[PDB]
Amino acid sequence: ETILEVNNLKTNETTPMQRLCFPVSVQSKTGELCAAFRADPGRDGPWQ
Amino acid sequence: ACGYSDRVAQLTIGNSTITTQEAANIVIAYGEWPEYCPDTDATAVDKPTRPDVSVNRFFTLDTKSWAKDSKGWYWKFPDVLTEVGVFGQNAQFHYLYRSGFCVHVQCNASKFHQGALLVAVLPEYVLGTIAENSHPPYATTQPGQVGAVLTHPYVLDAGIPLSQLTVCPHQWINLRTNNCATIIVPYMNTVPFDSALNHCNFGLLVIPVVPLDFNTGATSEIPITVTIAPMCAEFAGLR
Amino acid sequence: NLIETRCVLNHHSTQETAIGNFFSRAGLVSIITMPTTGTQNTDGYVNWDIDLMGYAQLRRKCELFTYMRFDAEFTFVVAKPNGELVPQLLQYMYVPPGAPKPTSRDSFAWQTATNPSVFVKMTDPPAQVSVPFMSPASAYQWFYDGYPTDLDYGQCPNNMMGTFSIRTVGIEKSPHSITLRVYMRIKHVRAWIPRPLRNQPYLFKTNPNYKGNDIKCTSTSRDKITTL
Incomplete structure (x- = not known):
């Protein structure tokens, strides 16, 4: 197992460390989506 | 049932899993276990349909926020799932219905919160308006998934004392200790197979006897998640 | 008061509390009056639907349970409005559920063989009969959280117990004014699922509606939690 960069935001490229984890807060209401990403290992995205 | 100091488990059923704590303190309605309907001439020339496919799993209802002034909530069975998953289209395309249930109720709170929820x-569960004659609406009589909120929890919206509801399969949730309940419910009717749409064999109630209290600055709304699991659910098609 | 004297040091018989003895004893469920002429008697017959939710005392007792099965016994006390008995011949016809009810003082409904009738003179001692468990379902139920098809919400027709057609025999009308008291006694009782007792005045026979403007507290109130 290795770290997935699920928080790969263009806004993250200058503070890359941030891309290793994503947040959850109280502000979020129950039932709202937190995140998503397909299981495409060999393809561009988080898995790289 | 389930409270602090219990080895956390992971119960899986079908294509669904819940991380619930193993607490051998489950409520078994009227001392009975959910079984498979005794031979009745109707299902003798028309055997009962028992979908174990995507009907026997763990259904999780949209959490409910519990605030200092919440009056209570309730759900009608089988109405609640009638609109949910194969449990809906199956219970609809098939005239007759019959099923028992594993009903799980669970709070999530800090050890700095306090509150008491009665679960029976x-x-x-017939209800009555404030009145002149006027039978309750169809939206509050059979609320479905979302459920409905109690208006007069003291009489249970039925002219009957809440103070006496423990004469029914109840389960207490006292944040100060446990934080989740579990109830086994056996099919109850005056006939083996009834109508899955018209009649609601029973109602589930979650009432906060002791209001929710905390010191401002702490989460103001406590979640109350409810998971439902059908046990030995059969359906009669009659074709 | 509260005279804390004379302490009962012997346990009582559990038979007392047994559902059988709780729901025993004959009781007045209906009173019909057929005076000669006034408002509703230029006819000379009565159709009484066997109704149990008639007297709240009985009803509140039943409502303690969700489903109930039982045999009933009926006794007919008849005399004139003032207690006098005359040699008048009476006919009580039992109109079974899903059966044609008399509409006229002489409807063919009174001759139908399938509608069992009982004949008795007013001087004769009270007529007594036992009517079984007519329900099509395994038991009667005081509550039906569903619909039988909304104005027809909670109405369960699998409870219909039949009707009693009373009237005086004879082509002509009866010269006497009658008033008969109907007593009913439940035999062979069985109850399932015990539910919370009523704590709000009853407002309708068919439902559990309560005056939400005036909700009464189950127990009296006091000044302080310590004043006793």
Whole structure:
């Protein structure tokens, strides 16, 4: 197992460390989506 | 049932899993276990349909926020799942219906919160308005998934004392200790197979006897998640 | 008061509390009056639907349970409005559920063989009969959280117990004014699912509606939690 960069935001490229984890807060209401990403290992995205 | 100091488990059923704590303190309605309907001439020339496919799993209802002034909530069975998953289209395309249930109720709170939730089941939970004659609406009589909120929890919206609801399969949730309940409910009717749409064999109630209290600055709304699991659910098609 | 004297040091018989003895004893469920002429008697017959939710005392007792099965016994006390008995011949016809009810003082309904009738003179001692468990379902139920098809919400027709057609025999009308008291006694009782007792005045026979403007507290109130 290795770290997935699920928080790969263009806004993250200058503070890359941030891309290793994503947040959850109280502000979020129950039932709202937190995140998503397909299981495409060999393809561009988080898995790289 | 389930409270602090219990080895956390992971119960899986079908294509669904819940991380619930193993607490051998489950409520078994009227001392009975959910079984498979005794031979009745109707299902003798028309055997009962028992979908174990995507009907026997763990259904999780949209959490409910519990605030200092919440009056209570309730759900009608089988109405609640009638609109949910194969449990809906199956219960609809098939005239007759019959099923028992594993009903799990669970709070999530800090050890700096306090509150007391009574959780009971009530067969044939008919309700009455404030009145002149006027039978309740169809939206509050059979609320479905979302459920409905109690207006007068003291009489249970039925002219009957809440103070006496423990004469029914109940389960207490006292944040100060446990934080989740579990109830086994056996099919109850005056006939083996009834109508999955018209009649609601029972109602589930979650009432906060002791209001929710905390010191401002702490989460103001406590979640109350409810998971439902059908046990030995059969359906009669008659074709 | 509260005279804390004379302490009962012997346990009582559990038979007392047994559902059988709780729901025993004959009781007045209906009173019909057929005076000669006034408002509703230029006819000379009565159709009484066997109704149990008639007297709240009985009803509140039943409502303690969700489903109930039982045999009933009926006794007919008849005399004139003032207690006098005359040699008048009476006919009580039992109109079974899903059966044609008399509409006229002489409807063919009174001759139908399938509608069992009982004949008795007013001087004769009270007529007594036992009517079984007519329900099509395994038991009667005081509550039906569903619909039988909304104005027809909670109405369960699998409870219909039949009707009693009373009237005086004879082509002509009866010269006497009658008033008969109907007593009913439940035999062979069985109850399932015990539910919370009523704590709000009853407002309708068919439902559990309560005056939401005036909700009464189950127990009296006091000044302080310590004043006793």
